[PDB]
């Protein structure tokens, strides 16, 4: 298995230095005739090429819109390809990818690879686990109606949280909405599931929120309100 | 500095239809053009280089054409697995530059949303700020008008909407509209309602509740 794997802290305060590493395994970083790239993508938007290098020469090439702030480099002893960005600000928030692509004219059978991406947030906010509130189903309308229930996951930082239901044993009908950045600097979302209203009396519903950046787990039971 | 102008920004077609994305470069780039597909939450994956040479593993319904300044990607028989963003990229000169992207949607038959409203729990009220949630589940097309009415009157500026990606199984959307208020404006009103308008409904659907019951 030849794979690219990226690492580096992704949560920065304004004006810190972002530092990301891309490690290749199953191949050598020196293998010739590959073009290595750093690319970034703000949420909802397009791709921007930061810069890159050919594995057979020692030059590295930079996008002029970022060249004053970025250093791209390579350490062959540890098979590392690196990105450093100085004085990050609001605009640097994005998913950062590395890529290794064949230089087609001298390498037709090598493998084109991408990192999994690292999500970089530049913010003054501090790490904060979420508060979770159940969203209780309404009263049953018909014998065979579907009920909706959910939970609201708010006031956390940074992204992401994951919501599962009944420890992941309930997946049909689950919709987890994309998070929204509030003006407080914290995020929030809702997770909902549709179930047969007949099963509300016989089956228990728990949302499991996992916020890995704060090592927090929250498990909330969702029940019908008792008048 | 070579601009890539990609069009359209989004497109919608039925399973089996034929779609094209075009990309025009601000200067001659010969056939130094690649097309990439990006599925939601994933890294891009190149569909072709040299304008038209498919990569291994890429279905033959994708094809490209063009030389010079104008380029086309075509999808012959649009499939559900094709829901993605698409980007051109030129590599005639540094810096490498991408087109702004095209979002591809599957056009399916009209389906009305089912609509649910969620009063805030007592614990949300105790916390100081509340969120009233309105859900629209499993509907198509995406255009939908969701309005908040509080004690009968339209409320404009404290709501936000959030929309799922098109579902890979049934090609529908779901949506949440969240009304965020302080505990004090919330308790000063009695009736909370969301009113949904959609091509799938023969007239607006209102779901409402009375605070405190």
């Amino acid at each position: 298995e030849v794979q690219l794997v990226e690492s580096g802290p992704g949560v920065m305060k304004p004006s810190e230095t972002l530092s990301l590493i891309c490690a290749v395994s199953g191949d050598t970083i020196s293998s010739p005739y590959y073009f290595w790239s750093w690319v970034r993508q703000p949420r909802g938007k397009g791709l921007e090429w930061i810069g890159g290098l050919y594995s057979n020469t020692m030059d590295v090439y930079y996008n002029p819109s970022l060249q004053s702030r970025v250093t791209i480099s390579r350490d062959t002893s540890k098979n590392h390809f690196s990105l450093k960005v100085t004085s990050v600000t609001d605009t640097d928030t994005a998913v950062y990818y590395c890529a290794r692509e064949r230089v087609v004219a001298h390498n037709y059978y090598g493998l084109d690879l991408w990192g999994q991406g690292v999500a970089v947030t530049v913010s003054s906010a501090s790490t904060k686990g979420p508060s979770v509130f159940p969203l209780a189903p309404s009263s049953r309308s018909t014998s065979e109606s579907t009920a909706a229930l959910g939970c609201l996951v708010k006031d956390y930082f940074p992204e992401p949280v994951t919501v599962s239901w009944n420890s992941g044993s309930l997946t049909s009908g689950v919709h987890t909405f994309p998070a929204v950045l509030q003006s407080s600097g914290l995020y929030s979302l809702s997770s909902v599931v549709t179930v047969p209203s007949s099963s509300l009396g016989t089956q228990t519903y728990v949302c499991n929120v996992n916020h890995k950046p704060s090592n927090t787990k929250v498990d909330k039971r969702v029940e019908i309100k008792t008048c | 500095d070579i601009q890539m102008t990609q069009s359209p920004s989004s497109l919608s077609a039925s399973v089996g239809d034929r779609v094209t994305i075009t990309c025009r470069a601000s200067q001659d780039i010969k056939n130094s053009l690649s097309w990439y597909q990006q599925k939601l939450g994933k890294a891009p994956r190149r569909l072709m280089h040299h304008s038209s040479t498919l990569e291994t593993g890429v279905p033959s319904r994708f094809s490209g054409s063009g030389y010079g300044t104008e380029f086309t990607l075509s999808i012959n028989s649009l499939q559900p697995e094709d829901i993605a963003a698409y980007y051109c990229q030129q590599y005639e000169d540094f810096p490498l530059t991408f087109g702004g992207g095209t979002q591809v949607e599957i056009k399916r038959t009209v389906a009305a949303p089912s609509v649910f409203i969620f009063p805030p729990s007592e614990d949300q009220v105790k916390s100081g700020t509340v969120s009233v949630v309105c859900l629209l589940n499993n509907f198509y097309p995406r255009e939908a008008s969701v309005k908040w009415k509080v004690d009968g009157a339209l409320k404009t500026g404290n709501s936000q909407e959030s929309v799922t990606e098109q579902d890979s199984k049934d090609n529908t959307y779901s949506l949440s509209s969240t009304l965020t208020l302080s505990s004090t404006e919330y308790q000063s009103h009695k009736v909370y309602a969301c009113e949904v308008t959609h091509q799938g409904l023969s007239s607006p659907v209102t779901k409402s509740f009375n605070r405190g019951e």
């Binding site: 790239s37 004219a105 001298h106 | 005639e92 000169d93 540094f94």
Partner: peptide
């Protein structure tokens, strides 16, 4: 001419 289309 450049990147994946470089020739050496």
């Amino acid at each position: 001419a450049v990147g994946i289309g470089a020739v050496f």
